Enzyme design. Sequence first.
Site, PDB file in Angstrom:
ATOM      1  CE1 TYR A 161      -4.073   1.915   0.663  1.00  0.00           C
ATOM      2  CE2 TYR A 161      -2.818   3.011   2.402  1.00  0.00           C
ATOM      3  CZ  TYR A 161      -3.947   2.931   1.597  1.00  0.00           C
ATOM      4  OH  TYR A 161      -4.941   3.877   1.725  1.00  0.00           O
ATOM      5  CB  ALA A 162       3.853   2.193   1.971  1.00  0.00           C
ATOM      6  CB  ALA A 163       5.375   0.435  -2.724  1.00  0.00           C
ATOM      7  CE  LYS A 165      -4.144   4.480  -1.696  1.00  0.00           C
ATOM      8  NZ  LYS A 165      -5.286   4.971  -2.509  1.00  0.00           N
TER       9      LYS A 165
END
Lengths: 252, 262, 263, 253
Positions: A161-163, A165
Site C-alpha cells: 500500500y505504501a509503495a 500510494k
Amino acid sequence: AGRLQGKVALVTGAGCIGPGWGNGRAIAVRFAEEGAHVIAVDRDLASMDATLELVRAAGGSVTPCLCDVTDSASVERLVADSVARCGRVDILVNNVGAPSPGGPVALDEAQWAMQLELNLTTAFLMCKYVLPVMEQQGGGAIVNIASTSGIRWTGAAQVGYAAAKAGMIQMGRVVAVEYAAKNVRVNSVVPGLLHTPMVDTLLRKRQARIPMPFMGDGRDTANAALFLASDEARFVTGTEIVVDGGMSARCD
Amino acid sequence: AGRLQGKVALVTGAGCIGPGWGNGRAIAVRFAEEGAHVIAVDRDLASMDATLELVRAAGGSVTPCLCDVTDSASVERLVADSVARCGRVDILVNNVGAPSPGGPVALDEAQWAMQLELNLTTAFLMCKYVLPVMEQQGGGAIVNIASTSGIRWTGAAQVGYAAAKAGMIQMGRVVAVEYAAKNVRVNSVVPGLLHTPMVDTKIAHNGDVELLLRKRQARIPMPFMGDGRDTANAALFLASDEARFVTGTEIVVDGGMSARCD
Amino acid sequence: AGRLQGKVALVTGAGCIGPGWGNGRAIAVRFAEEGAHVIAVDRDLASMDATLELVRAAGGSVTPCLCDVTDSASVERLVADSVARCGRVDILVNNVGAPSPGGPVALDEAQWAMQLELNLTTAFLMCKYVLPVMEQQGGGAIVNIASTSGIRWTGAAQVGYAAAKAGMIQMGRVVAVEYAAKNVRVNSVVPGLLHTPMVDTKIAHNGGDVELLLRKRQARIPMPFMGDGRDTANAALFLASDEARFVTGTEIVVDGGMSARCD
Amino acid sequence: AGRLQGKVALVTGAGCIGPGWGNGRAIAVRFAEEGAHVIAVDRDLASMDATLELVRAAGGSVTPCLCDVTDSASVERLVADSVARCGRVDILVNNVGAPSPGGPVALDEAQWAMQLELNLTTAFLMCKYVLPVMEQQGGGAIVNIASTSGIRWTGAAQVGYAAAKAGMIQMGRVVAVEYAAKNVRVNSVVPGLLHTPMVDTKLLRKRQARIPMPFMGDGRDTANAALFLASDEARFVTGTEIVVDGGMSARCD
Ligand SMILES: [Mg+2]
Ligand SMILES: [Mg+2]
Ligand SMILES: [Mg+2]
Ligand SMILES: [Mg+2]
C-alpha cells in the site's frame, strides 16, 4: 450554481462496506451537491445503494455502474459507456484502493501483486482510457485519492500500500506535466488517518498521532477533492493536498 | 582497511549491455575497492564479464551469479546460497531496473506490468529474503537505486518507471522504520541523468540526437553529466558504517537538476 | 451563506501599485464575496482604493487599515483595535512580501536584512499578536502566502526572498503543530509565476526585452496560461474555510505545474 | 591519500563547550583526518583548544581563527586572510547556529532577530565572501549544517530556529543552482536529535523514543555526512540534503 455545475464526474470506489462517510461515498455526495452528474463506480453494486439514496434525496444526479477497474477491457467499456450516455467525462476521481498488512517479509507475494494492482494499476487504467476523452473535449481534471502511507510510516506495516500510494502520487505528477498542454489537470488528495467505514473493519492511538483535536472522515477528503476538481483550481496541477490534521508535519 | 572492509555486498543489475560505468558495475567495483566481497547478480551472465575484469584489476573479490530477481523461487535460492557460501549478507544494493517510454495512453498495459515488476517488485523480493538474514545476523544496510523520475518529470514520459521508482523510494522509507530496531538501515540513491551504457545506447540507437543531448545537458546546472561512479560513491556512503545513523532517506545525485524548474 | 459567512479575516498587503489581481487584493475580494468581513491592511490607503471598490461592488464588507506590519507596536495596536471593532479575528492571511534581486554576492547586506524582515518577520509578528486572540476565542485559521521561490530555483537569483519564503512555509508548519490543540490551523499557499501588478510592473519597468522575458517565464509553466492573484485567493479561500477543518501544517502549490518538472 | 587531501576547509562554529562530539569539533577532527587543512573558526577562541589538540595529536593540520561571523567586516578579513595564508578556500562548512525556545507568542522579538542572524545570516555572509574565491579558483564545495527542525516539528517550539534552518536549506539549494556553472557545489546536512555537548547543557528518553534506530548519534555522524558532501566523491551532488536522524523524519506514528 454549484461549484461543479454541469460537469460529469466519474468516481471509482464509490461504494462503502458499511454506514458512514467513506471517501468514495463522501466524494459522490459532495460532487453531486455541487451540480455534477456523478458516475458512481464500484466492483459491488449493492455497496452503492446508500450512496445513491443520499445523492438523490438531495436532488442530485448519480448513475451506478458495476466495474472491476483492475480489468482494462472493463475500464475501456466503462469509459465508452460514460461518453455514450453523458457526452463528456469532465472529472475523474481515482478513489478505489485498500491496504493489506505486512512489510516485505510478512506480506505474501500474491498479496503484494494484488496491492499494486488495486491501488496503482487501477488509476493507471482509468487514466489510459479517460485521458483521450479529456484531450478531445478540451480538458478535464483528475483527482487521485492517495494516502499519507505514501509519504510516511504512519504506524503500521503495509508495504504494498505504501509503495503503490507513493507511485500513485508520482504518477499524478508526471501525467499532469505530460497533459497540461491539453488542459488536463492532475492532482492528489493525500488523506491521513480518517474515521471511515473501512477503518471500522485504537482510535485513541491513531488520534495521538494527529495534532488537531479530532479525526476527519471522508467528507474532509471530499472537500479537498472538490477544490482540486473545480475550475477554482484552474492553475493547480501536479501537486497534492494533504488532509491529515497535521500528522505528517510532526515526528515527535 | 577499506570503508566496507570484510562486508559481503549483494548487488543486482551488476552487468551492462556494453562498456562503461553503469550503476551496478560501478557499485560492484567501488564496493570491492573498499574491501567488500561482492556478490554480483544479473539476468545475463556475460554482461558481468567486464564487471569481473574491473574488480579483479583492482585486486577485489567478486562472485558472479546468474539470477532472474523477478522470480521469488530464484531469489530465495540466491540468498540461501549466498549465506551458505559467505556466512552473511551485510549489504544489499537493489539496482536492477530499466525504463520504458510512454505515459498512460501510450504505454501498453503489459509493459506497465513489466515496469512495476522490474523496477519495484525486484526490490520487494530481495528485501523479503534478505531481511531475515540481516535480522538474524545483527543488522545490515540496504541501498535502493531509484531515479529522479520518481520525484520529477525530467523530460520524457515513462509512467511505469516514474511510479515504480517513487514506490521504491517510499518502500525504502517504510522498511527503514519497520526494521530500524533490528539494526537494518535502508536508504535510496536517487540518480538523475547519467551516462550509463543502457541510457547512452538507447539514445544512440535513435528525432534529433544532437538536440536531445543538448536539452538533457541543459537541465543540469553542473558543467558535466555524471555516470555510474557518482551513483556508486553515494551508495558507498549509505552502505558504510559512516552512515550508521542515516536511515529512511535519500541522496539525490543529479548535478542540481531537481532543485530547479526554470 | 458564503463559505466564510460571519468570519472576520485580516489580510495584509491588501493593496496594489496598479489595477489588476494582486494576491492580497484578490484574497480580500474573494473572501468578502464568501461573506467574511475583511480587515484590509496595507502601508497606504491609495493602494487599497481599488481593492475597496471591488469588494464593495461585489456587495462585500471591508474596513481599510494602515499599518507597517514590520513594527510590533503597530501590529499590536492593529490587532487590539480589530478585536475592539469586530470582537474576534477568525482568519489571518499573511500576504505582505516582495522580492529583491541577487544571490549572496550581489544582494547587499542591508537588503538581505530588509528581505527577511518584510517576507518573514511580518508573518511572525502577525502570528505573535493574533494567536492569543484565536486561542482565547476557541480557534482560527492562518494562511501564509509564500512563493515557489521558497521551494525551487525558478529562474532568478533572489536569495533573501528564497530563504525568507522557505522560512515562512516552515514557520507555518511548526506553528500549526504547536497550536493545533487550540483549534488553530496554519497552512501556506505557494504561488508560482503569476500576473500580479507588482510582478508585471517590475518586468514592464526593467534589463532585457520584456516580451522575451514574458515568454521565457511562460515556457516554465506546463499549463497553457499564466494565473493571477485570483488563483492564489481561491486556494487561500479553501484553506481559510471550515471545509479545510482537517487540513493543517501543509501547503497548496498554485503554479500551473511548474515545480513538478525539471526538464 | 585522504578523502580531502590537499583541500583547505573553513569550518565555522568549530569550537565546543563541554565533553563529547559536538558537530563543529567532530567536523574539524574528521576533515583533518582526511588530509584537509582546517581553518577552525569560532567566536570563542578557547573553545577550540581541545579541537586543535585532537587534530594535532593525530598529526593533522589546523589553524584557529577568532571571528564573529555575524559581522561582515570580520568575515571579509577572515576570508582575505585565509586566501593570503592558504591560497585557496576549497570547502566552506557553515556550522554556526543554536536554537532558542518558543513559538511566535513566547519568543521575544529581539530573540527572533538573533535567531535569524545566528542561524541564517551567518551562512549568507560566509557565502557572500567565499563564493568569489571559489569562483575565481575554479570551484569549491559548501556544506550547510542545518537541522531537522527546518523540515519537521520534532518535539519543541523554537520558531526562529525552525524558520532560519528551513531558510538555510533553501538558500543552499538556490546558491547551488546559481553557482553550479562555476563548479561550486552547495548541499546541507540535516542532523536530527543528536547527543552533543550543546544539547547536553542548554529528556534523552523522550528524544530517544522518536528515533527508530536503537541509539542516538553525535557530531561524528554529522561530520561523516559533511565529509561525503565536501569531497570530490560527491562531484555530481549539489542542491540537496543528507538527513542524519536515525529514521525520525520518516515516521509520524
Ligand atoms: Mg506519540
Ligand atoms: Mg548500464
Ligand atoms: Mg500586487
Ligand atoms: Mg525549459
